């Protein structure tokens, strides 16, 4: 079995995956797609499996697509990256299947966004379908703030950022729940606690990890969500809602897992390499 590890900027996660590959005696190459072009040809077919780890979503998407063209199995697949990378596409699949999500209205213009704020009332959360680390996730408290947010997003250079996801603001436990699944099986979960002067739980924004016990309901919600999107190595963000119970907020197709490792002492890279060895050899 030959593995290719696809990178652009090598973070700790990529270093740990590389390390796990060598410690487990897996034949592997690294391709840096910030440095090398990828041809549509059969030459990449020399690899059995690709682990898709660029930090840029488009580099992940397109590197996966080119490798799949050559017949390489990619983790994750281009179809999964496309859906998990987009909140609206994710919510659509989850909602159709009866998996709880935050109550959401999609607005696709400035005019529609103002109408959605009027339908929802304040406070509310408005976020774009694309983004990580809490970027542009806004807690809108009144119409003045709403109107300024609409104006700002109208002046952005990616049209996806002009789509507004207008959601109920969930405020219950002061944290969110972050899970990892491999092969559509739950690896584990931990809690990210919202720090002072924040409304967002991301570790990147000062969110602090703690542990939770995973009950059957949480496990079922996470496994159902991962199965619906067919994600092979993904993270899942869950919010606790006072009436709905566990709601799925998003999935990530190139998950970071440093906080997960600190919180759980689970060797994510090792489990991932074991999984690949067990299924693709």
């Amino acid at each position: 079995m030959r593995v290719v590890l696809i990178v652009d900027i090598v973070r700790q996660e990529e270093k740990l995956i590389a390390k796990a590959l060598e410690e487990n005696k897996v034949q592997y190459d690294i391709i840096n797609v910030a440095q090398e072009p990828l041809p549509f040809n059969k030459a990449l077919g020399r690899y059995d499996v690709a682990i898709i780890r660029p930090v840029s979503m488009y580099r992940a998407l397109y590197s996966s697509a080119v490798l799949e063209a050559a017949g390489v199995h990619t983790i994750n697949s281009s179809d999964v990256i496309n859906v998990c990378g987009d909140k609206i596409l994710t919510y659509s699949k989850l909602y159709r299947e009866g998996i709880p999500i935050p109550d959401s209205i999609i607005a696709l213009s400035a005019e529609a966004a103002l109408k959605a704020y009027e339908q929802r009332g304040f406070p509310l959360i408005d976020k774009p379908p694309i983004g990580s680390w809490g970027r542009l996730v806004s807690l809108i408290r009144d119409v003045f703030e709403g109107k300024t947010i609409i104006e700002h997003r109208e002046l952005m250079g990616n049209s996806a950022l002009k789509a507004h996801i207008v959601q109920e603001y969930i405020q219950y436990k002061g944290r969110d729940i972050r899970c990892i699944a491999i092969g559509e099986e739950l690896l584990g979960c931990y809690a990210r606690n919202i720090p002072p002067n924040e409304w967002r739980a991301n570790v990147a924004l000062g969110g602090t990890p703690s542990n939770i016990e995973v009950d059957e309901k949480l496990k079922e919600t996470v496994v159902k969500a991962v199965s619906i999107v067919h994600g092979e190595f993904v993270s899942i963000d869950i919010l606790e809602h006072p009436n709905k119970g566990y709601v799925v907020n998003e999935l990530n197709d190139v998950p970071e897992f440093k906080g997960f490792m600190v919180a759980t002492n689970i060797n994510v890279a090792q489990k991932l390499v074991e999984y690949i060895k067990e299924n693709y050899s």
Binding site: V10, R11, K15
Partner: protein, 56 residues
């Protein structure tokens, strides 16, 4: 020299005694980094990307 942690990859970055706060250093992970002062510490954060108004 001083050994600082990369805010991107957590690798070790050897910053020269030459370095002043605001200088740019490249790390082997692919990140461009800026040195800055945090109290009595030199530290590293992600450098800004080139702007359309950058230069002379």
């Amino acid at each position: 020299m001083v050994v600082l942690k990369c805010p991107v990859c957590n690798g070790d970055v050897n910053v020269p005694d030459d370095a002043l706060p605001g200088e740019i250093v490249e790390h082997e992970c692919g990140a461009q980094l800026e040195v800055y002062n945090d109290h009595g510490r030199l530290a590293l954060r992600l450098a800004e990307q080139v702007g359309e108004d950058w230069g002379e």
